[PDB]
Amino acid sequence: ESEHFIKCVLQDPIWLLMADADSSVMMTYQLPSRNLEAVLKEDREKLKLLQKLQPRFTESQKQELREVHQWMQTGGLPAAIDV
Amino acid sequence: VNAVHWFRKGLRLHDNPALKECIQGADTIRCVYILDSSNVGINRWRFLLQCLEDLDANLRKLNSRLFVIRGQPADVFPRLFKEWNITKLSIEYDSEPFGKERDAAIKKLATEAGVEVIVRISHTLYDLDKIIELNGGQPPLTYKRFQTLVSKMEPLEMPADTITSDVIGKCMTPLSDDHDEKYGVPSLEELGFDTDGLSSAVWPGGETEALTRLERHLERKANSLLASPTGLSPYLRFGCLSCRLFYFKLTDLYKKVKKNSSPPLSLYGQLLWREFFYTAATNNPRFDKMEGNPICVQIPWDKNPEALAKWAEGRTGFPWIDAIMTQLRQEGWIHHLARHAVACFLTRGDLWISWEEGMKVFEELLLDADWSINAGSWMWLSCSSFFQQFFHCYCPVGFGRRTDPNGDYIRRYLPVLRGFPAKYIYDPWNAPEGIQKVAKCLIGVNYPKPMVNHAEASRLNIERMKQIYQQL
């Protein structure tokens, strides 16, 4: 009854609130061209902090992966990434 | 003595060991559903409300009614214990991290209020913890070891007999009048949803529809990306169809057509794959995140909120990806190959956006996106975890070109491009300026431009992921 603002509202999705889909962005926006060696070198630094946060497995968990992933058996790169 | 069964993820009356155990000798019973987020997520809530109305219709046949209540369970049940003098509280076991701490807190409120709690397993085939103990206290990292474990267990028991006239047995449901408008099932418009332009339900929720689709699905067992009339994945997630009943009717039908009492695990591939992510996430409170996840590779994704908006809303410029998101937004379901197509476009193929962002988009639109299954899939589709062997990324244009060259799926959900021919329906940006005017659709005005060049973006991200795994 005396609930002050009572007309409930359903807000937009998260991706529409966090971002701002310009009516031009919904048509014109295009991702910018990137420098390959520049984006790779910057990822090397950020991967250095994300080094001991990487997944660490035990004895049984490694042999559990080798029966599925050949790159765990060989030590190279996965078949999908190697292109 | 009074009793109350809490419905959450088991909106059905068949194979309900939690519900049937509560009505064994209780004098009173009452089925309660506690209903406590955006605009596009309407097919998700429309599915839920259809299941509750179906659950109430099947309860009406037993001179009972469903009790829908608003609010939080930590605030609702403490007053329902005293206002109804409740002694027994039965719930279906929830193995998900948030569900376990919610159940453990509610039963702590009930045990100190003199209420006994009944817990039964019905949403999963096996006891997930019993599978973890066989592996050595840790859930299996791969689907291969998981299949080896499920064959190392005793066979399942038959599903609990359905609640009927005798299961009740002089057990009155105290449906007093004034029940409607208080404990009734609200509509979409009562939740604040705009249903003026809403179409008819492509996936009608409910227990009756699940058993109907199950019968026709099994009848057709003894290419197209559209919604199949025999789909069961949304009803398995919402609990309208029990996986144990799906299991036994799959076994029994397989023994009849064949003569082999050892069915291969490919027969239950839909259930075991579903059961796998439930086991992999029950002991991982950070399974839906990358940082702090013990089984997720740390990847420095790019933070582009505006690019995520173009992808989620279906305005990327690629008619293949845009047609998948428009079907996902309108129908609430897309094919599994379509899920692999849009996941690569967002994660390890083009946009290089975190899989967590794509997880929350499917969380609102995809009807069969359970917290365990939807989180684990995005890690595998982005090569962030190792549940199953990886696969090459899908080129957006040259993928659906051979599924149908005319672009019938493209013109189906993208009517703005209904005037383009097969040589430009998948690549409208490579179309001449003259053919764009004759179709009443100019690229950049009526239809978005390609938000990224697939040639450079692919080789960009392939080299970035090479640097990641070579560093691991």
Numbering used by the authors:
A (entry chain B): 1125 to 1207
B (entry chain A): 3 to 38, 44 to 229, 242 to 491
What do the study authors state?
The basic helix-loop-helix PER-ARNT-SIM (bHLH-PAS) domain-containing transcription factor CLOCK:BMAL1 forms the positive component of the core feedback loop. PER and CRY proteins interact with each other to form a large complex with the kinase CK1δ and enter the nucleus after a delay to bind directly to CLOCK:BMAL1 and inhibit its activity. What structural features of CRY1 and CRY2 might lead to differential functions in the circadian clock? Both cryptochromes are defined by a highly conserved photolyase homology region (PHR) domain and divergent C-terminal tails that are intrinsically disordered. However, repression also relies on the recruitment of CRY1 to the PAS domain core of CLOCK:BMAL1 via the CLOCK PAS-B domain, which docks into the evolutionarily conserved secondary pocket on the CRY1 PHR domain.
In addition to binding near the BMAL1 TAD-binding site at the CC helix of CRY1 and CRY2, the PER2 CBD also wraps around the distal side of the PHR domain to come into close contact with the serine loop. To see if binding of the PER2 CBD truly alters the serine loop and secondary pocket of CRY1, we determined a crystal structure of the CRY1 PHR:PER2 CBD complex that eliminated this artifact. The overall conformation of the PER2 CBD in our structure is highly similar to the previously solved structure (0.76 Å Cɑ RMSD over PER2 residues 1136–1207). However, we now see that the serine loop maintains most of its flexibility in the PER2-bound state. Comparing the secondary binding pocket of the apo CRY1 PHR domain structure to our CRY1 PHR:PER2 CBD structure, we observed that PER2 CBD induces a modest structuring at the C-terminal end of the loop (residues 44–47). This reorganization is stabilized by an interaction between S45 on CRY1 and the backbone of Q1135 on the PER2 CBD. To determine if addition of the PER2 CBD alters binding between the CRY1 PHR domain and CLOCK:BMAL1, we utilized BLI binding assays using preformed CRY:PER2 CBD complexes with the immobilized PAS domain core and found that the CRY1:PER2 CBD complex binds with a ~ 3 fold reduction in affinity. Therefore, PER2 modestly weakens interaction of the CRY1 PHR domain with the CLOCK:BMAL1 PAS core, suggesting that this modest ordering of the CRY1 serine loop makes docking of the CLOCK PAS-B into the secondary pocket less favorable. Therefore, the addition of PER2 CBD causes the serine loops of CRY1 and CRY2 to take on a largely similar conformation, with the loop in CRY1 becoming more structured and the loop in CRY2 becoming less structured. Our data suggest that the differential effect of the PER2 CBD on CRY PHR binding to CLOCK:BMAL1 allows it to serve as a molecular equalizer—PER2 compensates for poorer binding by CRY2 by modestly enhancing its affinity for the transcription factor, while at the same time reducing CRY1 binding to bring the overall affinities of the two cryptochromes for the PAS domain core of CLOCK:BMAL1 to similar levels.
